[PDB]
Amino acid sequence: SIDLILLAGKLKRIPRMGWLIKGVPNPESVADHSYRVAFITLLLAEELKKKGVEIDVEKALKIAIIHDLGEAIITDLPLSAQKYLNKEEAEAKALKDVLPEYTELFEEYSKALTLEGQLVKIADKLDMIIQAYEYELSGAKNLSEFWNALEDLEKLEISRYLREIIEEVRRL
Amino acid sequence: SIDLILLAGKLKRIPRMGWLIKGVPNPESVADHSYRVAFITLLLAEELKKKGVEIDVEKALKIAIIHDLGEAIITDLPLSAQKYLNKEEAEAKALKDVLPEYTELFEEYSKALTLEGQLVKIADKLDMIIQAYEYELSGAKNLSEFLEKLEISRYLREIIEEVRRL
Amino acid sequence: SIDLILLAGKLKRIPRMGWLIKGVPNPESVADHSYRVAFITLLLAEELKKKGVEIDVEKALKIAIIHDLGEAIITDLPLSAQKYLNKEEAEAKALKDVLPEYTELFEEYSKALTLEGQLVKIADKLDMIIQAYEYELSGAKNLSEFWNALEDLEKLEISRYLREIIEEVRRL
Amino acid sequence: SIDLILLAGKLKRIPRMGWLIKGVPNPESVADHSYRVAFITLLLAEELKKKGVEIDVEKALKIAIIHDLGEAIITDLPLSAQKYLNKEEAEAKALKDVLPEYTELFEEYSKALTLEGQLVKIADKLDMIIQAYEYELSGAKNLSEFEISRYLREIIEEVRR
Amino acid sequence: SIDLILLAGKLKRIPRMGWLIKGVPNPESVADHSYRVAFITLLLAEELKKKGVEIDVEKALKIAIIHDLGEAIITDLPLSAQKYLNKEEAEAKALKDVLPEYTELFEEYSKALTLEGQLVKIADKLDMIIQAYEYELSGAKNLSEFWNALISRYLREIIEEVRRL
Amino acid sequence: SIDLILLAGKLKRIPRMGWLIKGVPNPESVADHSYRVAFITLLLAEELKKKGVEIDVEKALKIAIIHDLGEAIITDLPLSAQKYLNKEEAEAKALKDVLPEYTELFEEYSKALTLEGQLVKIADKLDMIIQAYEYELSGAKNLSEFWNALEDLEKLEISRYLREIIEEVRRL
């Protein structure tokens, strides 16, 4: 379907709103972010294989590609907005309406039960933390709280097989 | 309060999402929009005065200033998102938290029963309609989707005609 | 008239030039600026009603909305240019030519002859000083001179009633 | 490695130069582009599957992720530049130096040597064609110039329409 | 002086205001504009020289380089602003205070006192006309008035090529 | 020829890639850069005349104007790309094909052996280093390497006549 392709194209324009609201001047798009979540997911999957941890790599990659696709309809609701609206719920509804196909993949990510869902959750957070560091390098002085995501990572069981990359990142 | 001023400053950075998702390259901010909504309200309140219609202009200007201030917290949710989320309810909740003193003014705007509430509603739509035509002059070919249902439009036929004649 | 509305739309596009020349990447428009001047005017008006000071709020909001509308013709000439050009008088004359009712209001702001005019002058400078702080948070190191406006706030009769918000903003 | 992740981040900032040179004012980044190639690759692989065509979906998705990663080092060289400079050859070397393990995947893509490589080449072209249509909707008037296809006749004609 | 180079760097940021007000989304800077005015001045000067005209190429190039430099202080005054403010006068005063050594060259430009001064004026207009055509290719529909701008007996090949756009 | 002029117009839009890849948010164009290189060349030529060093100013300004014009075709290849591609060779070829009459001028620039070639090489590096300082003022923390080009100037004989400006630049 061309409509689905045009729908994913909205992620090239929809900004990542956390950065924007902080006054980061040319904030990345949701497509920008999702691209690197996929790349990170690929790298972390290979690291998990090295450690003998069984990962369905194909599944993890699909989840990374689709995980923020609901934002093509909902937009990237910032934390401030999430006090008053249920972001994942509206994303899930909108995903169900255009790609029911991938409804179970979003739930995996969203519920973060499966190793594959947790991995993408970790890739998601790593993209964001690393991106905060890069925006500080270009001048942002107000992104310290985007590092509170590391404490969240350790919450996930799979994080115990990724202590070396989590440390590489701490070392920023 | 500097914090409230900072809050209002977020409107300088929050984009108007309709234009952005359509592909308008440097879409206006919510402050840009709210500015001209206040200007249009002032202008139309004077044309109403001439026609012998009574308008509390102070109230109408206050309403225009605050009408999208909730979007500093909520952002400017596009129509696509409004299928899944209640825009106006979320803005009302947010405003009640930070600016409870402007809770009634936002309710006037949303209900659009008073002349002042309806005026700002009309001003809101005119800014958008006129902005679509302006972005079309600079290349947008996909804004065709961007008033008579409001009682007050009968006092404002001339400006509505001028807009339509664009 | 739709021409006046089109004229006001120009403030959405016209940059605030002092930021731009300093290297602030995506500086606010004159409309962004005037929007928050109106907001600040409304806050301070209410603050002055508390203190029992009589302000015509309608008039003060009108002045805030129109105070930079002549820049739609003149543009926002920076300090450097104001050494060679009479900006306030060029604006008054431009405004006279498009809406003579708006010339009187501009003059209240410009010459600070009324309490309402003074209030907008202060709101105008508070927007700017706070905006410099915000642009500092996102990387700007060369904006210290935009705090020199704080001293100018004290020159007006109205500032005797705003010794608080002044201190709030000095603290920054 | 954080270096690789930093390297891939450069794609969020490196512009798709074809559009930029045509005068498109806020051109997509290489990441933006690669995101939608990955999405299109997925969608099309599932259409191939519906038809009973064998395809390693995992491999195709990996290739889509990495297929423009060399551009994080080389940048996205426009056509005008490719008359003087060998873009694929430069991207292949750059990639080898950072991700030697994906050298053969890149080769499958760049020389369209497998069904998976072909699929990503197709998704890659479809993103650019559809993006040119999108930039025409927002104002561009100068974008007209912008085997496994036997299984993809439906989507190819949806695009033509 | 580093202050002079910082002064010239302001032109990389100061936008060409006519396009901006028209709604052209990422308008060229004054430096972008001056760069191509200098390039066109070089082309035009070499065309005159080949056709047998006595032309000081070095001078015309210096003039092209400095001709909008007063806009580092004054900014790029649009037509609307010029009904109320004297632009060239303001530019001349500002140049006088920072680059007094280029006052006489700016005068050649501003008053078209020399052939080299005139040539830069011609390059200046050509840049603008051709840039309107470029911004129309990318979507602008409201730039017709910027084609109104269209020795020239030695420049008829180029002026006809521009007309043909 | 309108084609030549359209070609030079490409420099208005082509970014200086070094900045962009660093995260500088609205980086200068090649034309922005090339403008100030021409400016600095003029300025330095005049400083050299005061020190008794004759320069062919006409030639030096032509060189400054054409020196990055091949980037209209090739783009501004960053250092990362230069490890795999011959930038200078590809620009010379592109120039030869469009402006064969300025081939020797771009040779002088690229070799930087003649007085005029050295002069424009100095101006080019000075524009870059000073631009790096300007971008740091607006928030970049990751541009220190660009100052290493100061070291490359001493290797050009003519810089012994330009010690006062080179010291001002170091003083930033």
Ligand code: NI
């Ligand atoms: Ni995400």
Ligand code: NI
């Ligand atoms: Ni509104």
Ligand code: NI
């Ligand atoms: Ni103001």
Ligand code: NI
């Ligand atoms: Ni590609």
Ligand code: NI
């Ligand atoms: Ni000029």
Ligand code: NI
């Ligand atoms: Ni250069």
